[PDB]
Coordinates of C-alpha atoms in Angstrom, one line a residue:
Chain A
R1 CA 221.8 10.7 195.7
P2 CA 218.3 9.3 195.9
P3 CA 215.5 9.7 193.1
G4 CA 213.2 12.0 192.7
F5 CA 209.2 11.7 194.2
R6 CA 198.1 10.1 196.9
Chain B
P1 CA 202.8 21.4 168.0
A2 CA 204.6 18.1 167.8
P3 CA 201.7 15.7 167.3
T4 CA 201.5 17.3 163.7
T5 CA 205.2 17.1 162.3
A6 CA 207.4 14.2 162.9
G7 CA 210.3 14.7 164.8
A8 CA 214.4 13.4 164.7
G9 CA 213.4 9.9 165.5
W10 CA 212.8 7.2 168.6
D11 CA 216.4 7.5 170.4
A12 CA 217.4 9.9 168.1
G13 CA 219.0 12.5 171.2
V14 CA 220.8 8.8 172.6
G15 CA 224.3 9.1 172.3
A16 CA 223.6 11.8 169.5
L17 CA 222.3 15.5 169.1
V18 CA 219.3 16.4 167.9
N19 CA 218.7 19.4 165.9
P20 CA 221.7 21.4 165.6
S21 CA 222.4 25.0 165.7
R22 CA 224.0 27.9 166.3
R23 CA 221.3 30.3 166.1
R24 CA 221.2 32.7 168.6
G25 CA 217.8 33.9 170.1
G26 CA 214.9 33.4 171.8
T27 CA 212.7 32.3 175.0
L28 CA 213.6 29.0 176.0
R29 CA 210.2 27.8 178.1
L30 CA 211.0 25.0 180.8
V31 CA 208.6 23.1 183.4
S32 CA 208.7 21.9 186.4
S33 CA 206.3 20.0 188.3
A34 CA 208.8 21.1 192.0
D35 CA 211.1 24.3 192.7
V36 CA 214.2 24.3 192.3
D37 CA 215.2 22.9 196.3
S38 CA 218.0 25.9 196.4
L39 CA 220.0 28.6 194.2
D40 CA 223.2 28.9 196.4
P41 CA 225.1 26.9 193.7
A42 CA 226.6 24.9 197.3
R43 CA 223.3 23.7 198.4
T44 CA 221.5 21.9 195.8
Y45 CA 221.1 17.7 195.4
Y46 CA 218.4 18.0 192.6
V47 CA 220.1 16.3 189.5
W48 CA 217.8 19.1 187.4
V49 CA 219.2 21.9 189.6
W50 CA 222.7 21.1 188.7
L51 CA 221.8 21.4 184.9
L52 CA 220.0 24.2 185.9
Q53 CA 223.4 25.2 186.9
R54 CA 225.7 25.1 183.8
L55 CA 223.4 27.8 182.9
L56 CA 224.4 30.0 186.0
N57 CA 228.1 29.2 186.8
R58 CA 231.1 27.9 185.6
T59 CA 233.1 25.9 187.6
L60 CA 237.4 24.8 187.6
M61 CA 235.9 21.3 185.5
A62 CA 232.8 21.0 183.5
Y63 CA 231.2 17.7 181.4
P64 CA 231.7 18.9 178.5
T65 CA 228.7 19.3 175.5
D66 CA 228.8 15.8 174.5
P67 CA 226.6 13.3 173.8
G68 CA 228.5 10.7 173.6
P69 CA 231.1 9.1 176.4
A70 CA 233.4 11.8 176.4
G71 CA 230.7 13.5 178.2
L72 CA 231.6 11.8 181.3
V73 CA 234.9 12.9 181.4
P74 CA 235.3 16.6 183.0
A75 CA 236.7 19.1 180.7
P76 CA 238.7 22.4 181.2
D77 CA 236.3 25.5 181.7
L78 CA 237.2 27.9 184.2
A79 CA 240.7 26.1 184.6
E80 CA 243.4 26.5 182.1
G81 CA 243.7 22.6 181.8
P82 CA 242.8 19.3 183.4
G83 CA 243.7 19.3 187.4
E84 CA 247.6 18.3 187.5
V85 CA 248.2 15.7 190.2
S86 CA 251.7 15.3 192.2
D87 CA 252.1 13.4 195.5
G88 CA 250.5 10.5 194.3
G89 CA 247.2 11.4 193.1
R90 CA 247.3 13.9 196.7
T91 CA 247.7 17.2 195.3
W92 CA 245.7 19.1 192.9
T93 CA 246.7 22.1 190.9
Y94 CA 244.2 24.4 188.8
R95 CA 245.4 27.0 186.9
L96 CA 242.5 29.6 186.2
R97 CA 242.0 31.6 182.8
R98 CA 242.4 35.2 183.5
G99 CA 240.2 38.0 182.6
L100 CA 236.9 36.4 183.5
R101 CA 234.2 38.4 185.6
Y102 CA 230.7 38.0 187.4
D103 CA 227.4 39.2 186.3
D104 CA 227.6 42.2 188.7
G105 CA 231.3 43.3 187.0
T106 CA 233.8 41.8 189.3
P107 CA 236.8 40.0 188.5
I108 CA 236.7 36.2 189.3
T109 CA 240.1 35.4 191.2
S110 CA 241.0 31.9 192.8
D111 CA 240.5 33.3 196.3
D112 CA 236.5 32.8 195.3
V113 CA 237.6 29.2 194.5
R114 CA 238.5 28.5 197.7
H115 CA 236.1 30.9 199.4
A116 CA 233.3 28.2 197.3
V117 CA 235.2 24.9 198.5
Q118 CA 235.3 26.6 202.7
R119 CA 231.6 27.3 202.3
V120 CA 230.7 23.9 202.1
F121 CA 232.2 23.9 205.7
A122 CA 229.5 25.3 207.0
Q123 CA 226.9 22.5 207.4
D124 CA 224.9 24.7 209.6
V125 CA 224.2 27.8 207.8
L126 CA 224.7 25.8 204.1
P127 CA 223.4 22.7 204.5
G128 CA 221.9 20.8 201.1
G129 CA 224.8 20.0 199.3
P130 CA 227.3 17.7 198.7
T131 CA 230.0 17.0 201.2
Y132 CA 232.7 15.1 199.8
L133 CA 234.9 18.0 199.9
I134 CA 235.2 17.7 203.7
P135 CA 236.8 14.6 204.2
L136 CA 239.7 15.6 201.7
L137 CA 240.4 18.9 202.7
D138 CA 239.2 18.7 206.3
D139 CA 242.8 18.3 209.0
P140 CA 241.5 16.2 211.7
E141 CA 243.8 17.4 214.5
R142 CA 242.7 21.1 213.4
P143 CA 239.7 20.8 212.3
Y144 CA 238.2 24.1 210.0
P145 CA 234.7 25.3 211.5
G146 CA 233.9 26.9 207.8
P147 CA 234.6 30.7 207.0
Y148 CA 232.0 32.3 209.1
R149 CA 233.8 31.2 212.2
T150 CA 236.9 31.9 211.4
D151 CA 239.0 34.0 208.3
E152 CA 242.0 31.9 208.4
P153 CA 241.7 30.0 205.1
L154 CA 241.9 26.4 205.2
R155 CA 244.9 24.7 205.2
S156 CA 244.8 22.7 202.6
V157 CA 243.7 24.8 200.3
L158 CA 246.3 27.2 198.7
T159 CA 246.1 30.0 196.4
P160 CA 250.0 31.1 195.8
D161 CA 248.5 33.8 193.0
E162 CA 244.9 35.6 191.7
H163 CA 245.1 32.7 188.8
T164 CA 246.3 29.1 191.0
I165 CA 244.5 27.2 193.1
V166 CA 246.0 23.8 195.2
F167 CA 244.5 21.3 196.5
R168 CA 246.5 19.3 199.4
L169 CA 244.0 16.2 200.2
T170 CA 244.3 13.5 203.4
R171 CA 244.3 11.1 201.1
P172 CA 244.8 10.1 197.3
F173 CA 241.7 10.3 194.9
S174 CA 241.8 10.1 191.5
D175 CA 238.0 11.2 191.0
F176 CA 239.1 15.1 192.1
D177 CA 238.2 16.7 188.7
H178 CA 234.5 15.5 188.9
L179 CA 234.1 17.5 192.6
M180 CA 235.7 20.4 191.2
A181 CA 232.8 20.2 188.4
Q182 CA 230.0 19.6 191.0
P183 CA 228.2 23.2 192.0
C184 CA 229.2 23.4 195.4
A185 CA 232.8 24.0 193.4
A186 CA 231.5 26.8 191.7
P187 CA 233.3 30.3 192.6
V188 CA 231.5 32.4 195.1
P189 CA 233.3 35.6 196.0
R190 CA 233.2 36.5 199.4
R191 CA 232.3 40.1 199.2
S192 CA 229.1 38.9 197.8
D193 CA 228.6 36.3 200.1
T194 CA 225.0 36.9 201.9
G195 CA 225.4 33.0 203.9
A196 CA 222.1 31.8 204.4
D197 CA 220.4 34.1 202.3
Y198 CA 222.8 34.1 199.4
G199 CA 220.1 32.0 197.0
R200 CA 218.1 34.9 196.9
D201 CA 220.9 36.9 195.0
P202 CA 223.6 35.0 193.9
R203 CA 226.1 35.8 192.0
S204 CA 226.6 34.7 188.2
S205 CA 230.0 33.4 186.7
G206 CA 228.3 31.4 183.7
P207 CA 226.4 32.8 180.6
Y208 CA 223.0 33.3 182.4
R209 CA 222.2 34.7 185.5
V210 CA 219.0 34.9 188.2
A211 CA 216.6 37.6 186.7
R212 CA 213.4 36.9 188.6
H213 CA 212.5 33.9 191.4
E214 CA 208.9 33.3 192.9
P215 CA 208.8 30.6 195.0
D216 CA 207.1 27.6 193.6
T217 CA 205.2 29.8 191.3
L218 CA 208.1 31.1 188.2
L219 CA 211.8 31.5 187.5
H220 CA 213.2 33.5 184.8
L221 CA 217.1 34.0 183.9
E222 CA 218.5 36.6 181.8
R223 CA 222.2 36.3 179.6
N224 CA 224.6 37.5 182.4
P225 CA 226.3 41.1 180.1
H226 CA 230.2 39.8 181.5
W227 CA 230.1 36.6 180.5
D228 CA 233.0 36.0 177.4
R229 CA 231.6 33.5 175.1
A230 CA 235.5 33.4 173.9
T231 CA 237.0 32.0 177.1
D232 CA 233.6 29.3 177.6
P233 CA 234.6 26.3 176.1
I234 CA 231.4 24.7 177.2
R235 CA 228.5 26.5 176.4
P236 CA 227.2 28.1 173.5
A237 CA 224.2 30.1 175.3
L238 CA 221.8 30.4 172.1
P239 CA 219.2 31.7 174.0
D240 CA 218.0 35.0 174.9
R241 CA 215.9 33.7 177.9
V242 CA 215.3 30.7 179.1
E243 CA 211.6 30.8 181.7
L244 CA 210.8 28.2 183.9
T245 CA 206.7 27.4 185.0
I246 CA 207.3 25.7 188.2
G247 CA 204.4 23.5 190.4
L248 CA 202.7 21.9 188.0
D249 CA 201.0 18.3 188.5
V250 CA 202.8 15.9 186.6
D251 CA 200.1 14.5 183.9
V252 CA 199.2 18.3 183.9
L253 CA 202.9 19.2 182.7
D254 CA 203.5 15.9 180.6
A255 CA 199.7 17.4 178.4
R256 CA 201.5 20.7 178.4
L257 CA 204.6 20.0 176.7
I258 CA 203.3 17.8 174.4
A259 CA 200.9 20.6 173.3
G260 CA 204.0 22.7 173.1
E261 CA 203.2 25.4 175.6
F262 CA 206.2 24.3 177.3
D263 CA 209.4 23.3 175.1
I264 CA 210.9 20.9 177.4
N265 CA 211.1 19.3 180.8
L266 CA 213.6 20.8 183.4
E267 CA 212.6 18.3 185.9
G268 CA 213.0 15.9 183.2
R269 CA 211.6 12.8 185.7
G270 CA 210.1 11.7 182.2
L271 CA 206.9 10.6 181.1
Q272 CA 204.2 10.1 183.8
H273 CA 202.1 6.4 182.9
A274 CA 199.7 8.6 180.4
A275 CA 201.4 10.2 178.4
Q276 CA 203.9 7.1 177.7
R277 CA 201.1 5.0 176.5
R278 CA 200.2 8.2 174.2
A279 CA 203.9 9.0 173.4
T280 CA 205.1 5.0 172.8
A281 CA 202.2 4.3 171.0
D282 CA 201.7 6.8 168.6
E283 CA 204.1 6.8 165.6
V284 CA 204.5 10.9 165.2
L285 CA 204.9 11.3 168.9
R286 CA 207.6 8.2 168.9
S287 CA 209.7 10.4 166.2
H288 CA 209.8 13.2 169.4
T289 CA 210.8 10.9 172.1
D290 CA 214.1 9.5 173.8
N291 CA 214.0 6.3 176.6
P292 CA 218.0 6.5 177.9
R293 CA 219.0 4.8 181.0
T294 CA 219.2 7.0 183.7
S295 CA 222.0 5.7 185.8
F296 CA 220.4 4.7 188.8
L297 CA 219.8 1.6 190.2
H298 CA 216.7 0.3 192.1
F299 CA 218.2 -2.7 194.0
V300 CA 217.1 -4.3 197.3
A301 CA 219.5 -4.1 200.1
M302 CA 219.8 -7.1 203.4
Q303 CA 220.9 -5.9 206.1
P304 CA 223.2 -8.9 208.6
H305 CA 222.9 -6.5 211.8
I306 CA 219.0 -7.6 211.6
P307 CA 218.5 -11.0 212.0
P308 CA 218.5 -14.0 210.2
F309 CA 220.0 -11.8 207.6
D310 CA 223.4 -11.9 209.4
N311 CA 223.7 -15.9 208.0
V312 CA 225.2 -15.6 204.1
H313 CA 222.8 -18.4 203.1
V314 CA 219.5 -16.7 204.3
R315 CA 221.1 -13.8 202.2
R316 CA 221.5 -15.8 199.1
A317 CA 218.4 -17.8 199.5
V318 CA 216.6 -14.3 199.2
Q319 CA 218.6 -13.8 195.5
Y320 CA 217.8 -17.0 194.7
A321 CA 214.1 -16.6 195.0
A322 CA 214.0 -13.7 193.9
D323 CA 211.0 -13.1 190.9
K324 CA 212.8 -11.2 188.5
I325 CA 210.4 -10.8 185.8
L326 CA 207.7 -10.1 188.4
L327 CA 210.1 -7.6 189.9
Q328 CA 210.7 -5.6 186.9
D329 CA 206.4 -5.6 186.1
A330 CA 206.2 -4.5 189.6
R331 CA 208.7 -1.1 188.8
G332 CA 207.2 -1.1 185.0
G333 CA 207.4 -4.4 182.6
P334 CA 206.6 -6.0 180.7
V335 CA 207.7 -3.1 178.3
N336 CA 208.4 0.1 180.6
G337 CA 210.1 -1.4 183.3
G338 CA 214.4 0.0 182.7
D339 CA 216.5 -2.5 181.9
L340 CA 217.1 -6.3 184.0
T341 CA 220.2 -6.0 185.6
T342 CA 222.1 -9.1 187.6
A343 CA 225.0 -6.5 188.5
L344 CA 225.8 -2.9 190.4
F345 CA 227.4 -0.9 187.7
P346 CA 225.7 1.4 185.0
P347 CA 227.3 0.4 181.5
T348 CA 228.1 3.7 181.2
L349 CA 231.3 2.7 184.2
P350 CA 234.5 1.5 182.3
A351 CA 234.5 -1.5 185.6
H352 CA 230.8 -2.7 183.8
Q353 CA 231.4 -6.4 183.6
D354 CA 229.1 -9.5 183.6
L355 CA 228.6 -10.8 186.9
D356 CA 225.9 -12.9 187.7
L357 CA 226.1 -14.9 190.9
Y358 CA 222.4 -16.1 192.0
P359 CA 221.4 -16.9 188.6
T360 CA 217.9 -17.3 188.6
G361 CA 217.1 -20.2 186.7
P362 CA 215.7 -20.2 183.1
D363 CA 213.1 -18.2 182.8
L364 CA 214.7 -15.5 185.2
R365 CA 211.6 -16.2 187.6
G366 CA 213.8 -18.0 190.6
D367 CA 215.2 -20.7 191.2
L368 CA 213.7 -22.6 194.6
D369 CA 215.7 -25.5 194.3
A370 CA 218.9 -23.1 194.5
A371 CA 216.8 -21.2 197.4
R372 CA 216.1 -23.9 199.7
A373 CA 219.2 -25.3 199.4
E374 CA 220.8 -22.0 200.7
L375 CA 217.8 -22.4 203.7
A376 CA 219.1 -25.4 204.4
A377 CA 222.9 -24.1 204.8
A378 CA 221.0 -21.5 206.9
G379 CA 219.8 -23.5 209.4
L380 CA 215.9 -21.9 208.2
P381 CA 214.9 -25.1 206.1
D382 CA 211.6 -24.2 205.7
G383 CA 211.4 -20.2 206.1
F384 CA 211.3 -17.5 208.5
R385 CA 209.0 -14.3 209.5
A386 CA 211.1 -11.4 208.0
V387 CA 210.4 -7.6 207.2
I388 CA 210.7 -5.4 204.1
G389 CA 211.0 -1.5 204.1
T390 CA 209.8 0.8 202.0
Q391 CA 207.8 3.2 201.3
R392 CA 203.9 4.0 199.4
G393 CA 203.7 4.0 195.7
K394 CA 206.6 2.2 193.6
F395 CA 208.9 0.8 196.2
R396 CA 205.2 -0.6 197.6
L397 CA 204.7 -2.5 194.8
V398 CA 208.1 -4.0 194.4
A399 CA 208.1 -4.4 198.6
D400 CA 204.5 -7.1 197.5
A401 CA 206.4 -8.7 194.4
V402 CA 209.4 -9.4 197.0
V403 CA 206.8 -11.0 199.4
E404 CA 205.4 -12.5 196.7
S405 CA 208.8 -13.8 195.7
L406 CA 209.7 -15.3 199.4
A407 CA 206.6 -16.8 199.6
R408 CA 207.3 -19.6 197.8
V409 CA 210.0 -20.9 199.7
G410 CA 208.2 -20.1 203.3
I411 CA 210.1 -16.7 203.8
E412 CA 207.1 -14.7 205.2
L413 CA 207.3 -11.1 204.9
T414 CA 205.4 -8.2 206.5
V415 CA 205.7 -4.8 204.6
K416 CA 206.9 -2.0 207.1
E417 CA 206.2 1.6 204.9
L418 CA 208.9 4.2 206.6
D419 CA 207.5 8.4 206.0
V420 CA 208.0 9.3 202.8
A421 CA 209.6 12.9 202.9
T422 CA 212.2 11.4 205.3
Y423 CA 212.5 8.0 203.6
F424 CA 215.9 8.7 202.3
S425 CA 217.2 10.3 205.2
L426 CA 215.6 9.1 208.7
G427 CA 214.0 6.4 207.6
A428 CA 216.4 3.8 205.2
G429 CA 219.0 6.0 205.4
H430 CA 219.5 5.6 209.6
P431 CA 220.5 2.2 211.0
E432 CA 218.6 3.0 214.1
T433 CA 215.5 3.6 212.3
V434 CA 216.3 -0.3 210.8
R435 CA 217.4 -1.3 213.7
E436 CA 214.0 -0.7 215.4
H437 CA 212.0 -1.5 212.8
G438 CA 214.0 -4.4 212.2
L439 CA 213.9 -3.9 208.7
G440 CA 215.8 -6.8 206.9
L441 CA 215.4 -5.7 204.2
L442 CA 215.0 -2.6 201.8
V443 CA 213.6 -1.4 199.0
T444 CA 215.6 1.6 197.0
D445 CA 216.9 3.8 194.1
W446 CA 220.2 4.9 193.7
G447 CA 222.1 7.7 192.0
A448 CA 226.0 7.6 191.8
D449 CA 227.1 12.1 192.3
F450 CA 229.9 11.8 189.5
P451 CA 229.5 9.3 186.8
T452 CA 232.4 7.1 188.1
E453 CA 232.9 4.2 189.6
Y454 CA 233.7 5.7 193.4
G455 CA 231.1 8.3 192.7
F456 CA 228.5 5.1 192.0
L457 CA 229.6 2.4 194.4
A458 CA 231.4 3.5 197.5
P459 CA 228.7 5.3 199.4
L460 CA 227.1 2.1 198.9
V461 CA 229.4 -0.4 200.3
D462 CA 232.5 1.4 201.6
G463 CA 232.6 0.6 205.6
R464 CA 234.1 3.9 206.2
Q465 CA 231.0 5.8 203.9
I466 CA 228.9 4.9 207.3
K467 CA 226.4 7.3 208.4
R468 CA 225.3 6.5 211.8
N469 CA 223.1 10.2 211.8
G470 CA 221.4 9.5 209.2
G471 CA 221.8 10.1 205.4
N472 CA 223.6 6.7 205.4
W473 CA 223.5 4.7 201.7
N474 CA 225.7 2.0 202.9
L475 CA 222.3 0.2 204.3
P476 CA 223.8 -3.7 204.8
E477 CA 226.4 -0.9 206.8
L478 CA 229.0 -3.3 204.9
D479 CA 232.4 -3.4 206.3
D480 CA 235.1 -5.3 204.6
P481 CA 238.2 -4.6 205.2
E482 CA 239.2 -6.3 202.1
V483 CA 236.2 -4.5 200.3
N484 CA 237.5 -0.7 201.7
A485 CA 241.4 -1.8 201.2
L486 CA 240.7 -2.4 197.3
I487 CA 238.5 1.1 197.4
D488 CA 241.3 2.6 198.4
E489 CA 244.0 1.2 195.7
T490 CA 241.2 2.3 192.7
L491 CA 241.9 6.2 194.8
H492 CA 245.9 6.0 193.3
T493 CA 246.1 4.0 190.4
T494 CA 246.5 6.4 188.1
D495 CA 245.8 4.5 185.1
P496 CA 242.3 4.2 184.6
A497 CA 242.0 0.0 183.0
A498 CA 243.9 -0.7 186.1
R499 CA 241.9 1.1 188.3
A500 CA 238.2 -0.8 186.1
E501 CA 239.9 -4.1 187.3
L502 CA 240.2 -3.2 190.8
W503 CA 236.6 -2.2 191.1
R504 CA 235.4 -5.0 189.1
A505 CA 236.9 -7.1 192.4
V506 CA 235.6 -5.0 194.8
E507 CA 231.7 -5.8 192.9
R508 CA 232.3 -9.4 192.5
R509 CA 233.4 -8.8 196.6
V510 CA 230.4 -7.2 197.1
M511 CA 228.3 -9.7 195.3
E512 CA 229.7 -12.6 197.2
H513 CA 228.6 -11.6 200.4
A514 CA 224.6 -11.1 198.6
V515 CA 223.8 -8.2 200.7
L516 CA 222.4 -6.6 197.4
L517 CA 220.4 -7.6 194.9
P518 CA 220.2 -5.6 192.6
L519 CA 216.5 -5.4 190.2
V520 CA 216.5 -2.9 187.2
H521 CA 218.8 0.2 185.8
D522 CA 215.8 2.6 185.5
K523 CA 215.1 4.1 182.4
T524 CA 213.2 6.9 181.3
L525 CA 211.1 8.7 178.6
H526 CA 211.7 12.2 177.9
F527 CA 209.7 14.2 175.4
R528 CA 211.1 16.9 173.0
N529 CA 209.7 19.5 171.2
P530 CA 210.6 19.8 167.4
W531 CA 211.9 23.4 167.4
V532 CA 214.6 23.0 170.2
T533 CA 217.9 22.8 168.5
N534 CA 220.5 20.8 170.6
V535 CA 219.0 18.5 172.2
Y536 CA 220.7 15.6 173.6
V537 CA 220.6 13.2 176.8
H538 CA 223.8 14.2 179.0
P539 CA 225.5 10.7 179.8
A540 CA 226.8 12.9 183.1
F541 CA 223.3 13.5 183.9
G542 CA 220.6 10.9 182.4
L543 CA 218.9 14.3 181.4
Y544 CA 218.7 16.6 178.7
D545 CA 221.9 19.3 178.6
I546 CA 219.8 21.9 179.3
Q547 CA 222.2 24.5 178.5
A548 CA 222.8 23.0 175.2
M549 CA 219.6 24.2 173.6
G550 CA 218.2 26.7 171.1
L551 CA 215.3 27.7 169.2
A552 CA 214.7 27.8 165.4
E553 CA 214.4 30.7 163.8

C-alpha cells in the first residue's frame, strides 16, 4: 500500500 | 494527564508490552484525522482500518497478540489450526471452529468464508480492498464474475461441510495464511450481504460491533453479545466500548492527545513536527513515546522506458551520486528522518541482508568519481537532462534533494509535481502518465500488504505485477525472467530458510539492475497515555495493536 497523507 | 506523570519509558512498547492488564471495562477513546475508507471489511486498504477490523471481525488466521517476531506469523483464529498444505502448495485446507456466531446471533459457517472471498471478485460493486485472491482462485478459461452475477460458487473454493473449506489455487503460494488474515477474508454471510451498502450495517464476528458511524465525525463500537471469549485465542476484548473521534487537524489531534482528551491515535501516522519536538525533548513526555520502524520503505524508482534511463550506467550513476545524508535530512534528519538503508527489505523479514552495491563514499554523501565513471560508460560523461516526478509536501523536499545531489555530476533535473489525490493510482502509478511526462525518476513510499518478502517485494519488481491501467507499483516495469522465476521458486519452497536465501538472490538481482534507489526505512513517533493497558507496536503493522488495549481502573 501507499502511505497516509497547504 | 501524561505530562505530569512518568510513563513506562522511551520505546517501552517496541518489542514489548506496556502496562499489562486483564482488567475489563471502560471506554477506549480513540482519535483519527481521517474517516475510515470503508466499514465493509472487503473494501478497506488503510492500515489503521485493518487494525480496527481486529475488533470487528475474525478471520481464519490472524496475527497473534505478540510484540515479538511471532507476531509476524498468522495464528489460528476462526480455524482450529494453520492452513494444511497439499498438492505442492496448491491446495490449502482449513477447519472452522464450531458453534461460532455473528452479532445477530446467527451461525458462522464455511459458506460465509467462501462468500467473503467470492465478494472480492465483484470489483464493480466492492472496490477498495486487496485483490491478491483473484489471480490465485480465478480460472482464466472460466472467469468468475462474482456472487452478484452468478449464484454458482467459485470452482476453486470447496466447502465439503459447514466446518471445512478448501482452496484450490492456480499456482503454489507459500504465504496463503497471510491472505486469510486480511479483512477481505473475514466471513460475510450471504443472507446479510447488502452489497454496495454492506458498510452501512455489516455483521460482526469479532468482540465488537458498529453501534454508530457518523461520516467525518465519529465511530462508536459496542460489545458483540454473541462473541465467545472461550473460542478466541487472539482478543482480550477489555473495554466495554470504543469511541473514535474523527476529522481533527493533525496538530490539533496531537495537542489534545498529549493533554489526555483522547487515549490513543488510532490513525497512527505519528506525532507531527511540533509534537515530535515537544515530546522528544521533555523527560516525562519521552517516557510516553515509542519510535518504531513502520516497515515502509522510502525510495526513488528509475524507469528504463524513459531515455536515457534504459542504460544501466545512467541508473548506477544516479545511485552513486545520491547524497544519502541530504536525502534523509529532506525526509526529517538529522535526528528524525527514518533509518538509512542501502537495500530494500525491512529488518522484520527473514531475507534482510547486508547489500550495498553502490556505496556513497566514507561520509555517505555521494561517490562522485564512481558516478562520473558510470556516466562515461553510458556515453553521457557530462550528464543529461531528466525529470523527477513527485507530489507537493515531503516528497517534493526529497525530489529537491535529488535535484541537488545529481547536479554535482551534470544531471540536470526538473521537478514535475503530480496530483496529490491520484498520485499512487493515476500519477506515478500509471505507466502512460509516466511516459507522457517523461518521468525517468519517481519519488515514492511503499508498505507491504502482508509481512513477507513476497508481500513486500513482488509488487515492486515482479514483471507479472505491472498494472497497465493504474495502481502500478512496479514503477521501473522490471520484467526480468530470472527475477520472476526466483519468485516462483520461493512460492513453492516449504523450508523458510531456503526461501530466505532465494529472496536474498532476488534482492541482489534487483539492485544489480539499479532501478530502485533505497533511501530510508521509515520510522514514526507514537504517543501513549499512561492509563492505557496492553500497549505495544504490532510488528505486522508498525502501529499499536488497538484490540489488545484496555483501561486502568
